[PDB]
Design goal:
homodimer, alpha+beta, seven-stranded antiparallel β-sheet, 7 strands, transcription corepressor activity (chain A), signal (chain A)
């Protein structure tokens, strides 16, 4: 269940963990829209049913537009909302109401290293069983968001700012 | 209310825009801490009431919002919407990142709506989002729209399908 709204770090970890996907903002490298912000929908997982770590893992292909973008500028902002569940519908909260909790995680997106490759794979493949069947020729790699900044919109008033250290220090 | 033929990417894009009550808007951040970084954020939207979706994404925005402070400095933005916002992808067994779980990106500028278009924006938004009638006047809400110059549709294998604004708006 949703953590107390005053505990922003806990709220962020709750929302990251319950999201199976989110929207990732990048800078376009396409010549026609070069330099303009771009948005895209990615599947994600921070871990299996009882062990969400807050780390957003992705499974990506060099063919993807967002990956072309990250090759030229690896900064990205991921946004997730509880409107992705039935939470907001059930409470009658408009998706734009800060009662319909949403968060933004910004940082850089990198290919996961050898040590973390097994946890990334397991986190992603358990949550997304279709990935096992994706086409091998598209050259899939495991990636992650390295979070440097966090905004939490869970009540009226400004965004609540949470440090990566505070976010990762949650159980 | 079923999904159009996937080959008709213009029709599919209009279908997605109309079934979406919200989307993710990407802007360039003007926050000191992260200036110049791509920023994403969740906005409510509407293109019309139930039988009059025009395809035009209208927003109800406040100068207090992070996205709006970004748009004042650079009005370029990209909105994305996915059928994973409904039960469509779960019911059919399409992973949210499978192109079969349709998602679209509409890129352009966000501007304040004209006097002559305020009423249609208002009617479109307030009917889809009745809570907005109760939002605080102190936030100085205004009606905004996305002016679309570029459209990508992910609705099948084989990569993105490009749709021109004129194809998208000529859908009936």
């Amino acid at each position: 269940s949703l953590p107390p709204r005053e505990d922003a770090a806990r709220v962020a970890r709750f929302v990251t963990h319950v999201s199976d996907w989110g929207a990732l903002a990048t800078i376009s490298t396409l010549e026609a829209v070069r330099g303009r912000p771009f948005a895209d929908v990615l599947s994600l997982s921070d871990g299996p049913p009882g062990a969400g770590s807050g780390v957003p893992y992705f499974y990506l292909s060099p063919l993807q537009l967002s990956v072309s973008n990250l090759q030229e500028n690896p900064y990205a902002t991921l946004t997730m909302t509880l409107a992705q569940t039935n939470f907001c519908k059930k409470h009658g909260f408009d998706p734009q109401s800060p009662l319909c909790v949403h968060i933004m995680l910004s940082g850089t997106v990198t290919k996961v290293n050898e040590t973390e490759m097994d946890i990334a794979k397991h986190s992603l493949f358990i949550r997304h069983p279709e990935m096992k069947t994706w086409p091998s020729s598209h050259n899939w790699f495991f990636a992650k968001l390295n979070i440097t900044n966090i905004w939490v919109l869970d009540y009226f008033g400004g965004p609540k700012i949470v440090t990566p250290e505070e976010y990762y220090n949650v159980t």
